[PDB]
Design a protein around this ligand. Structure first.
Ligand SMILES: *Cc1cc2c(cc1C)nc1c(=O)[nH]c(=O)nc-1n2C[C@H](O)[C@H](O)[C@H](O)COP(=O)(O)OP(=O)(O)OC[C@H]1O[C@@H](n2cnc3c(N)ncnc32)[C@H](O)[C@@H]1O
Ligand SMILES: *Cc1cc2c(cc1C)nc1c(=O)[nH]c(=O)nc-1n2C[C@H](O)[C@H](O)[C@H](O)COP(=O)(O)OP(=O)(O)OC[C@H]1O[C@@H](n2cnc3c(N)ncnc32)[C@H](O)[C@@H]1O
Ligand SMILES: *Cc1cc2c(cc1C)nc1c(=O)[nH]c(=O)nc-1n2C[C@H](O)[C@H](O)[C@H](O)COP(=O)(O)OP(=O)(O)OC[C@H]1O[C@@H](n2cnc3c(N)ncnc32)[C@H](O)[C@@H]1O
Ligand SMILES: O=C1[C@H](O)O[C@H](CO)[C@@H](O)[C@@H]1O
Ligand SMILES: O=C1[C@H](O)O[C@H](CO)[C@@H](O)[C@@H]1O
Lengths: 577, 577, 85, 85
């Protein structure tokens, strides 16, 4: 490790890797630190679902996700256990136990909020949905010219889509995908459009998809190397970044304090440019530990002079979920072109279709799959092939329906026991609401309590705002109930419900963007530069200042690309030496 | 990849790595294949619990284990779901769904049996307990000379302990460990001895333990390399090994058929020596798919001519579990040397001890820890420091108590919700029974049904034998109830119970060892050579032919060392070229 | 009314406990009953007063659409008969 | 009905139950029959059902009914966790 770099990046998630891809490519001497370690095999920071074994056992990947989601703020537990043996030591109070945060009001929390500390961040396990935001959900990059704003976002999103390898074609030959999409498309009378979820992924075979990740964006190999002999990049895992050192004027960062978790030793690293991409929670934590904002319980009587909007106006999406069991009508529709005679398993049974007939509702590729499955597996009562890929359907956020939708199969909440209902019948429904930014909704950090890395303990003070946000959230629930019914009834044990606040992991606005610090109640400008500072940039969903329902990562990446352009325009790389 | 090696090893678990360590070191040109992929970071095949983040969040590692335990044989599901919507497609029968095995009697299964397909095998997640077996549990290596047999086992176990870095000192400064061990030691009136569980692990700091794994045994890096320029080793992950090719005489293996899971292509690999270390289930599967034993449902009327004992005499241990909440008496004992005056949190409160006093029950290191914790954390009602390591206690199997015991904290069954009871109070109890080998207890492979890798589907026909095994299992349960009571009452939700058969993952005897194929009803000799074959060896717990309660891996490793000695005595490495 | 034969797998019995080899008829179950074509929730009450000793007491009338005819070809007469009753 | 077993954590004054009841088409195939071998607790022929909700109007309406409860209930409040539709 050197003591001086051109650029230091904190965090090796997909957003930190966006900065690495852009700036390593442009010739900067870059160092990247991550508190977590190299996990994913020899492709550093890659998607953990890209093993042959997981894609043959997709029901097991939920466990991998759960194993790297560490809760942000757990309130003191008040469950009464009164069936202990009289001999066992028994509490007299509900004291602070087992990592709980005594600052946390359990009734004003994001209990589901969690963080992932591994190289590649949450992109080692994510669902890879990368929709664009429409104007209604999106911050302005150009103030008073909507066409210019549109053109800027189109350019950035197109580049981000390339970095992530976003596509909308990978599930086109799925019978289940078609069954669902086709039904919904026909039922909404032209007024809501259904398409494939945009997914950061490349199909390699009919039963394997290479899901994208941080590694897709930037391979995280140290440089120079044979393939990039004139690039300069070092990744340092197991390094907790603790403090950026401000000058007196709050115009420059002069150093980064790091803690090597293997040796235990602490160091300071100099750079020309500091980029914080540690996640929406941990960017904020690092800044607060560095003297930005206000440490401790908020108090308006003494509001912070440095970045007063930091940790305020936080947003998290409402999330509703259910699963459905495909309707009899839809299952029969799969085989509607078949002539079926006799009884399965008996000598005289047959399933035939007429290739190319005009009366057929499906193309030959579909009917071949169905016929062969029905004839070769007469023990099986469904017409859907066993290896048929999952549905991946959305109708995107619109004014009339201001929520994102995913009608799909997610690796999350498989759970623990095998499904009794055939998997080919099951479809997940996830609708995601937008949350109004409100000053009262805060992420703050204790001045006494510390987390597992001896850093100020995060605490939420959050409620979904009472007006539009709440009305829309409940309307969203209703919409999922109505729309899902067109596909099938609810699966027992996966009935319509709101998920624990924050379990969705789409937190934004913790270090939010705008044009003017005071007027727009914000922390970074449109180049993601922290107001007042020449050389400090923040990347991630914490920059997004708007109420958004769609998945935020692509938007955050687009903002990071724009920020890198600024850096390239304003800092000279050091000579390669 | 070459088409010819001196030695081919199937499986990169700790047993395959024992063969690699011994034979790569001795100058053989070695190839190793694993169906699974490089997981554990840059230390190939290492323990996944060796991240800073897991050892700060030990409650989360259960998820990692669950995520790589793929059930061996799941019977057809017969749960009645009668609350589907009338529109949903509804089954008329309990048909084969969701990977279930229609060959499997649900009432004669090892439902908990599972396999792990990752480089390093189950050693990437295991608990690292490596006790020796006493004579009663151990197969003979020398037939009619107990002293010679003892000396052979001592030599092999000592080497295996070195390979694994087994020790019994890593938890000596734990207050909780001491509290438990000291109490039990005093209560058994000299007739049962308590010691630390022997653990394959090296402590690096008071809050970090480097758990051993396959990587400890052999680092799995390709050779030649800078550190080993005259060694020759290649690891090939994502390669399913499907068949060994027998000659007509069943005296030699002529080839190994492999399937590259990335390209999809199939190849054949030649070696002088073939070693199968794919686990107790998958060794058996590979052999059966190669024409050993009998494919399909057993039928005595047509018993196999080649290795007729293969897949018979299988053993799995009964496992009983509970957790306890430490007694008030034990908690008060922690602070017995303290003079405590006043009320915690008040001006006049104090906790003192007299260093070096003869009346003290504890040494100064203990009383310093307790005093500082009690004075610095007056909000906390327990005298045990927050970072105190976990207990790791055993009384080893003996004739009078023929079960292994672990009195400890295991990463398995943390579960899902935070504990309401303080973790410092909680102790896990796992007692492990020995199971008599019986011919009727079988692992067999379907001639029609295939698993996810298109290999014959494993099916169990197992019941715990009715006599000694069953009497001992129930006596073992009682013993855990009696012994645990000395420490505290049961923790609600972790009451004394038998675990699902096979969840313990200590299956043995599937390809068992003995001196004479017919007389000892066995498959390999004491060099782990398959009877009749010059060049085929099996390694792993499937070799162990006895009823054993202790954890089998160290014993299996010892047998593998002996097998490697035979190979070194009988095959010449090729010239380094 | 009709409880099908139970097929829940209990595989954590102690080895000493008597363990079934089949899903035999146990505990009042009806071996005639297909569990997948049942009214599993159907039940009966055998006490004086019947189910009216516990019911919710909701007593709506049926409109024509739900109601059997008491008069065959005169809807007004049918309505008048039902209103009276 | 369905108070259950544990005290409600949510204040009872806030809680409203929703029960929507569908109509089922009479179909000859839907039967209540009695075993000629198996007997009930009063030594009478054991009742057995052979029932499925009919596939057409009955089923369409049942699912539309579910939707209607979801839509209508929303006007009053969100679902109570543990008592989801
Ligand atoms: C968990 C998850 C997330 C997810 C999702 C499904 C699941 C189960 N599905 C998504 C989807 O379909 N579409 C989408 O847009 N997002 C989805 N997500 C969320 C997505 O993964 C995140 O939005 C994205 O990963 C955020 O990227 P970012 O690069 O900003 O942050 P990160 O991935 O959390 O990585 C941050 C890294 O910083 C390291 N760290 C944290 N603190 C420090 C300190 N102090 N020092 C050094 N390094 C630090 C972390 O270890 C992490 O690697
Ligand atoms: C899961 C587990 C295991 C465990 C334990 C706790 C848990 C949660 N605690 C233990 C303990 O405290 N003490 C002990 O002695 N054992 C404990 N275990 C069990 C232990 O992990 C196993 O006994 C040991 O790992 C067995 O070693 P072995 O090398 O024989 O087998 P393996 O680890 O299962 O690895 C086999 C490899 O073979 C590959 N494979 C399988 N099939 C194929 C084919 N056809 N082709 C190529 N490769 C194959 C697997 O992928 C695996 O890596
Ligand atoms: C249980 C229940 C029922 C109920 C309800 C809520 C509950 C929890 N809420 C209702 C409501 O709001 N509105 C409504 O219209 N009905 C509601 N119900 C159903 C209602 O209680 C029943 O429809 C009504 O009680 C039926 O009356 P009926 O007089 O026809 O039948 P019964 O109450 O079941 O009584 C029958 C008696 O016969 C005796 N018995 C049975 N077998 C024999 C033989 N072989 N020999 C002699 N006596 C016999 C029974 O013991 C019973 O008392
Ligand atoms: O972005 C998302 C959120 O963070 O996770 C959900 C469940 O995995 C995903 O379905 C969704 O794509
Ligand atoms: O060897 C073992 C078995 O395989 O797993 C148990 C739970 O992890 C362990 O406690 C035990 O050490």
């Amino acid at each position: 490790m050197d003591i001086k770099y051109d650029v230091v990046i904190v965090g090796s998630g997909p957003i930190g890797c966006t900065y690495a891809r852009e700036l390593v490519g442009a010739g900067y001497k870059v160092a990247m630190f991550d508190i977590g370690e190299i996990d994913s095999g020899l492709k550093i920071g890659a998607h953990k679902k890209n093993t042959v074994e997981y894609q043959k056992n997709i029901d097991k990947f939920v466990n991998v996700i759960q194993g790297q989601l560490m809760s942000v703020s757990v309130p003191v537990n008040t469950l009464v256990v009164d069936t202990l043996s009289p001999t066992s030591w028994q509490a007299s109070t509900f004291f602070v136990r087992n990592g709980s945060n005594p600052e946390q009001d359990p009734l004003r929390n994001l209990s589901g909020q969690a963080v992932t500390r591994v190289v590649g961040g949450m992109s080692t396990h994510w669902t890879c949905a990368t929709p664009r935001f429409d104007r209604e959900q999106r911050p302005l990059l150009v103030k008073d010219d909507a066409d210019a704003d549109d053109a800027e976002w189109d350019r950035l999103y197109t580049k981000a889509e390339s970095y992530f390898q976003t596509g909308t074609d990978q599930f086109k030959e799925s019978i289940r995908h078609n069954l669902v999409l086709n039904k919904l498309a026909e039922e909404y009378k032209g007024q809501r459009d259904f398409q494939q979820i945009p997914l950061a992924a490349t199909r390699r075979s009919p039963t394997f998809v290479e899901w994208s990740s941080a590694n897709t964006v930037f391979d995280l190999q140290n440089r120079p190397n044979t393939d990039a002999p004139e690039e300069r990049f070092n990744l340092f895992p197991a390094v907790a970044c603790e403090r950026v050192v401000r000058n007196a004027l709050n115009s420059e960062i002069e150093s980064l304090h790091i803690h090597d978790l293997i040796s235990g030793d602490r160091f300071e690293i100099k750079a020309d440019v500091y980029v914080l991409t540690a996640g929406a929670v941990h960017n904020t934590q690092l800044l607060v530990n560095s003297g930005f904002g206000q440490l401790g319980r908020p108090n308006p009587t003494n509001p912070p002079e440095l970045l007063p909007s930091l940790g305020s106006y936080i947003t998290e999406q409402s999330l509703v979920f259910c699963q459905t069991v495909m309707s009899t009508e839809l299952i029969d529709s799969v085989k509607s072109d078949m002539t079926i005679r006799g009884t399965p398993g008996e000598l005289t049974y047959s399933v035939t279709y007429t290739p190319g007939a005009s009366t057929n509702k499906h193309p030959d590729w579909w009917n071949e799959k169905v016929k062969n499955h029905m004839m070769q597996h007469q023990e099986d009562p469904l017409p859907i092939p066993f290896e048929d890929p999952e549905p991946q359907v959305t109708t995107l956020f619109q004014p009339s329906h201001p929520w994102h939708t995913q009608i799909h199969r997610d690796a999350f909440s498989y759970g623990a026991v095998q499904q009794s209902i055939d998997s080919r019948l099951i479809v997940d429904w996830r609708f995601f609401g937008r949350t109004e930014p409100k000053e009262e909704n805060k992420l703050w950090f204790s001045d006494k309590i510390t987390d597992a890395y001896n850093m100020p303990q995060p605490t939420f003070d959050f409620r979904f705002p009472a007006g539009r946000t709440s009305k829309e959230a409940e309307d969203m629930m209703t919409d999922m109930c109505v729309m899902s019914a067109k596909i099938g009834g609810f699966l027992p044990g996966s009935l319509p419900q709101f998920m624990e606040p924050g379990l969705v992991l789409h937190l934004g606005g913790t270090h939010r963007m705008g044009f003017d610090e005071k007027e727009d109640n914000c922390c970074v400008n449109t180049d993601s530069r922290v107001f007042g500072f020449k050389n400090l940039f923040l990347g991630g969903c914490g920059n997004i200042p708007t109420a958004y329902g769609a998945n935020p990562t692509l938007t955050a990446m687009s903002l990071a690309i724009k920020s890198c352009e600024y850096i390239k325009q304003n800092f000279t790389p050091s000579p390669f030496t």
